[PDB]
Design a protein around this ligand. Structure first.
Ligand SMILES: [Mg+2]
Ligand SMILES: [Mg+2]
Ligand SMILES: [Mg+2]
Ligand SMILES: [Mg+2]
Ligand SMILES: [Mg+2]
Ligand SMILES: [Mg+2]
Ligand SMILES: [Mg+2]
Ligand SMILES: [Mg+2]
Ligand SMILES: [Mg+2]
Ligand SMILES: [Mg+2]
Ligand SMILES: [Mg+2]
Ligand SMILES: [Mg+2]
Ligand SMILES: [Mg+2]
Ligand SMILES: [Mg+2]
Ligand SMILES: [Mg+2]
Ligand SMILES: [Mg+2]
Ligand SMILES: [Mg+2]
Ligand SMILES: [Mg+2]
Ligand SMILES: [Mg+2]
Ligand SMILES: [Mg+2]
Ligand SMILES: [Mg+2]
Ligand SMILES: [Mg+2]
Ligand SMILES: [Mg+2]
Ligand SMILES: [Mg+2]
Ligand SMILES: [Mg+2]
Ligand SMILES: [Mg+2]
Ligand SMILES: [Mg+2]
Ligand SMILES: [Mg+2]
Ligand SMILES: [Mg+2]
Ligand SMILES: [Mg+2]
Ligand SMILES: [Mg+2]
Ligand SMILES: [Mg+2]
Ligand SMILES: [Mg+2]
Ligand SMILES: [Mg+2]
Ligand SMILES: [Mg+2]
Ligand SMILES: [Mg+2]
Lengths: 30, 205, 100, 151, 262
RNA sequence: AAACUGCGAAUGGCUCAUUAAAUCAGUUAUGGUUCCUUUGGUCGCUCGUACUUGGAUAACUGUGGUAAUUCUAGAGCUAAUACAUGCCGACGGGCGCUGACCCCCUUCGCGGGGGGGAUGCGUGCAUUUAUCAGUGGUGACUCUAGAUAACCUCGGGCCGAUCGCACGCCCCCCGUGGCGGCGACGACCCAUUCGAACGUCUGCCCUAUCAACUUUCGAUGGUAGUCGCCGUGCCUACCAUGGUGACCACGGGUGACGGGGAAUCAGGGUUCGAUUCCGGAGAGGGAGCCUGAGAAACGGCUACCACAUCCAAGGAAGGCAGCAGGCGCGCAAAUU
RNA sequence: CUCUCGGCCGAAGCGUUUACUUUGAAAAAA
């Protein structure tokens, strides 16, 4: 359970950080 | 027994107040733990909530930290020299928080000689033992000698600490409360604070 | 061997007290001559000293070494049966059993 | 020197002033970094607190206290204790039977930080609530405004 | 007193239990649990006073000891168990499901739901904190602690929990324009749309809500529970849609119902 | 059955003696503490006989003492989720420092670099101290989380030697056979629930034939400590001379427990509230404690003061302001 | 009410501050 939850949250956190950085990049570029 | 309540005190105006209830369990107090210097002796106290308080009655060692070098080591406690709150504590050699004590310097000297590979605390007579000679004059390769020579750039200590190392004893200040946690922990005095406490000790004599 | 006894008022003898007469002690759990009724209860009880004197109603004795003959009431009787060990390790120790 | 007036050494607990450095950086200036914090609620930190050298553990800006509770106001009446003053709060109490009011007052002992200087008797002070600092002190001075007669 | 109190006087019980005065001296003191004593509904009160299944307290115990009642999918045998807001009660013997939702009068209502809906619940995020090894933790209004939540979820938001696994499926953010219900105060049981939020540093925040009919009111921030996004709730609503009627129009509705009866 | 173990007995019930910014009521705070239990989260995260370890004690069987008690003494047996002691496994490694040696570039060469590395020490969560950098949150942390050097109490933190019900799948196999489902109990630490405890602002009846009070023995504030579950003259040492008061301080009285409320009342108001709900206090008067998460507990203990029971005079045992009931008191109040 | 910065509104300063009045919230049951 610990391993599975850690892996799933790692994937979710990567997705969230990528989304936030992409939106910030779009705001800066415009 | 010993009560530390607030309703036995006079009012702000100065008039006295009549109590409306007797002494309660949660307002109790306990006799002081006069911690001396000697072989370790600690008694546990059952406190409110079922927890424990370690009531140290005798202590002789503790871990102190050299902050500038960030070197924490376990060293024995030798004597008590100064106490800001009361000088009677110095006479009876009582270990309390913020008291100034003397500790041994050997582990700090060992770490310093193993790190910078320079003499420290040695007499000018240059007498040596082969173990210390191979600790200081060991055969190292080019890469390791390069790191040691670079470390030798920052190897410098104030005259006060060097004199204390020559004496074999350092001045330290205790930061933990021995009567509450059962251990005497602190830090080595250095800098302006060391000068202040040296002046206080000299003026006391 | 001197186990214990009772003086002429019926009070028992305690090992610790070293006197010829009675004393009053505050007894708690783990003490002989007392049995608490509540958790943490203590009570003041009168206890006779350990020193043997002439003012004793009864004195207790335990035979440790046997003599030439055997008392007709004490020794010649056959030993009675008793409960056997209940823990497995004590069974093995009594009967010298191996693990197999 | 001037700061060190007690038998014990007066230090700011959260600042480490024994950090070793090269001999070139020692010659420049022996300027200890000051510890201060923003207390919130729109109150600004006085410049004397940031640039000062005083030591006060009960100061709302450079000490170990927390401001939470009620924010009150008063007029300075007495300045004779060490780092603490006495202010007076005036109000009117309503009597239902006569449909009128009566004048009443209260006295408060509050802690005054060394950052606030040039405080005279008769000027307005805004204080905030904190944990009990002594037997009778529960408030700390947050702002000082001068009297109407200031020139 | 010298310690915790174990009794509850009947007249000192919460008034939304609708207990009568002459039945007895005591009232069932709720056990410690997910919900507060003043904001819960004991199992016995719901089981004998609301549903009329049992007549005495003994029959409630006889029902409970047969392991028939489930709260949030778990069997509870305690007859004073504190059941609170947005909880699911299942009786498989009769095949019934209920959800505890306040009515417009500020009382818990007997609200039957589809067994498909009984698989999830809504929770309000109460606390967000990072624990050992840098693991985020989320604490809800019903004492549930969930590890590794979505990084976008903050306090005062709503999360949907699947009762079987106890894991977040999705969430609703606390923003103006969403649907909310009041869980305490004078406006308890009312449903509306958030209009604006007033921030008072060092004090309580005030939030304004407007219902479907256009009536406006305000509450504290702690008394608001976000139900759905926009105008669409994520749960089924009771008979009243959350609109509080005045006494005059309640009388008018009652008279109209009486006239049409017969 | 009995006895050991566990839990409760700190709730409830009674009374209003004390108590005049005290209690209490409304309003805030704990970013200054503790918290049985319920609910949820963690519980191979530590690299260092286990196919189950040890000694006793009751109940029981026998022998007894005292005028007397819910007094107990000796002897013979036997258990644990009582009392103790202690492994394996995961365990392959990973990461921080020490680092003999081995290579790869530039250099004529020194020298300037980039890697690999055997051998040693440390390692997880809690505890104490020092230092460094700045995931998530607050109006505000000396917050949470991270890193580094150590420490870690023998009156000793955790890391399961416990119980029940259904019992099945797998192997070169018939074994040391391997695996597996629901629960019960226990436990270090977070969160929650029930609280408790200290604080903020405002508010109380008569009395000046009570006008100055407090500070030797803490009264007001500062510094460092002790004690305490925490904040604080709570206490200690060294210091400053402070603090309150006609807006009534201080003292005295109250046939004064405080409110939600009650009687009378055009509108104002006057009087009452021991009494079933919410807080407080007490168990003949004081004081000191054990156990426990929680008591300065009294249908717990230990003393003194006042009463008072049995006695074989050596001793033993007491607390109805709990329900009935009895004496006394009174104008004044019910069934052992 | 006021410039600025962000999406007419949003943030921030408001008000020299109160007293008063009118709202709103929190306010045990009996
Ligand atoms: Mg009293
Ligand atoms: Mg009038
Ligand atoms: Mg009671
Ligand atoms: Mg209950
Ligand atoms: Mg028992
Ligand atoms: Mg108990
Ligand atoms: Mg009764
Ligand atoms: Mg109050
Ligand atoms: Mg605290
Ligand atoms: Mg708990
Ligand atoms: Mg025996
Ligand atoms: Mg045990
Ligand atoms: Mg930290
Ligand atoms: Mg202090
Ligand atoms: Mg002080
Ligand atoms: Mg009265
Ligand atoms: Mg009275
Ligand atoms: Mg009238
Ligand atoms: Mg009239
Ligand atoms: Mg009343
Ligand atoms: Mg009353
Ligand atoms: Mg009376
Ligand atoms: Mg009491
Ligand atoms: Mg009584
Ligand atoms: Mg009496
Ligand atoms: Mg008594
Ligand atoms: Mg207990
Ligand atoms: Mg008592
Ligand atoms: Mg009684
Ligand atoms: Mg009682
Ligand atoms: Mg009676
Ligand atoms: Mg009786
Ligand atoms: Mg009558
Ligand atoms: Mg009569
Ligand atoms: Mg009310
Ligand atoms: Mg009411």
């Amino acid at each position: 359970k610990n391993k599975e939850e850690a892996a799933e949250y790692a994937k979710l956190l990567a997705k969230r950080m990528k989304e936030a950085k992409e939106k910030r990049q779009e705001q800066i570029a415009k | 027994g010993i009560s530390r309540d607030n309703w036995h005190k006079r009012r702000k105006t100065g008039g006295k107040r009549k109590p409306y209830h007797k002494k309660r369990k949660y307002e109790l107090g306990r006799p002081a733990a006069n911690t001396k210097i000697g072989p370790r002796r600690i008694h546990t106290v059952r406190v409110r909530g079922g927890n424990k308080k370690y009531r140290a009655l005798r202590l002789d060692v503790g871990n102190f930290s050299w902050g500038s070098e960030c070197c924490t080591r376990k060293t024995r406690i030798i004597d008590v020299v100064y106490n800001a709150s009361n000088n009677e504590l110095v006479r009876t050699k009582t270990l309390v928080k913020n008291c100034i004590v003397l500790i041994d310097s050997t582990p700090y000297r060992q770490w310093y000689e193993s790190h910078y590979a320079l003499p420290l605390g040695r007499k000018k007579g240059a007498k040596l033992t082969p173990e210390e000679e191979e600790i200081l004059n060991k055969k190292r390769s080019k890469k390791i000698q390069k790191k040691y020579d670079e470390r030798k750039k920052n190897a410098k200590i104030s005259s006060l600490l060097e004199e204390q190392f020559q004496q074999g004893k350092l001045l330290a200040c205790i930061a933990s409360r021995p009567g509450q946690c059962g251990r005497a922990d602190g830090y080595v005095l250095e800098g302006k604070e060391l000068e202040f406490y040296l002046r206080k000790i000299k003026a006391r004599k | 061997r001197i186990s214990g006894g009772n003086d002429k008022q019926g009070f028992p003898m305690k090992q610790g007290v070293l006197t010829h007469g009675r004393v009053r002690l505050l007894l708690s759990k783990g003490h002989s001559c007392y049995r608490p009724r509540r958790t943490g209860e203590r009570k003041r009880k009168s206890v006779r000293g350990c020193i043997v004197d002439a003012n004793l109603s009864v004195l207790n004795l335990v035979i440790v070494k046997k003599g030439e003959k055997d008392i007709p009431g004490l020794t010649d009787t056959t030993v009675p049966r008793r409960l056997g060990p209940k823990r497995a390790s004590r069974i093995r120790k009594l009967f010298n059993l191996s693990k197999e | 020197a001037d700061i060190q007036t007690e038998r014990a050494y007066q230090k700011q607990p959260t600042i480490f002033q024994n950090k070793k450095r090269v001999l070139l950086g020692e010659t420049g200036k022996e300027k200890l970094p000051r510890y201060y914090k923003n207390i919130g609620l729109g109150f600004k930190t006085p410049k004397e607190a940031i640039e000062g050298t005083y030591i006060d553990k009960k100061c709302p800006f450079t000490g170990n206290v927390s401001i939470r509770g009620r924010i009150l106001s008063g007029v300075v009446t007495k300045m004779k204790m060490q780092r603490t003053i006495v202010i007076r709060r005036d109000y009117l109490h309503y009597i239902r039977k006569y449909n009128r009011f009566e004048k009443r007052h209260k006295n408060m002992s509050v802690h005054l930080s060394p950052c606030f200087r040039d405080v005279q008797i008769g000027d307005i002070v805004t204080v905030g609530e904190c944990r009990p600092l002594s037997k009778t002190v529960r408030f700390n001075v947050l702002k000082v405004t001068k009297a109407a007669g200031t020139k | 007193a010298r310690g915790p109190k174990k009794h509850l006087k009947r007249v000192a019980a919460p008034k939304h239990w609708m207990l009568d005065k002459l039945t007895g001296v005591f009232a069932p003191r709720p056990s410690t649990g997910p919900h507060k004593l003043r904001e819960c509904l004991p199992l016995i009160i719901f089981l004998r006073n609301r549903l009329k299944y049992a007549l005495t307290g003994d029959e409630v115990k006889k029902i409970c000891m047969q392991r028939f009642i489930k709260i949030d999918g778990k069997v509870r045998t305690d007859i004073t168990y504190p059941a609170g807001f947005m909880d699911v009660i299942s009786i498989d013997k009769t095949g019934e499901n209920f959800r505890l939702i306040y009515d417009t009068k500020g009382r818990f209502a007997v609200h039957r739901i589809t067994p498909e809906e009984a698989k999830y619940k809504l929770c309000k995020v109460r606390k967000i904190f990072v624990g050992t090894k840098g693991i985020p933790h989320l604490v809800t209004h019903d004492a549930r602690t969930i590890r590794y939540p979505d990084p976008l979820i903050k306090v005062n938001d709503t999360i949907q929990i699947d009762l079987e696994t106890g894991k977040i499926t999705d969430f609703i953010k606390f923003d103006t324009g969403n649907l909310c219900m009041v869980t305490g105060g004078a406006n308890l049981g009312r449903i509306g749309v958030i209009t604006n939020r007033e921030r008072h540093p060092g004090s309580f925040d005030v939030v304004h809500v407007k219902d479907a009919n256009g009536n406006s009111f305000a509450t504290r921030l702690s008394n608001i529970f976000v139900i759905g996004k926009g105008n669409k709730p994520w749960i089924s609503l009771p008979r009243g849609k959350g609109i509080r009627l005045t006494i005059a129009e309640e009388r008018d509705k009652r008279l109209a119902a009486k006239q049409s009866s017969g």
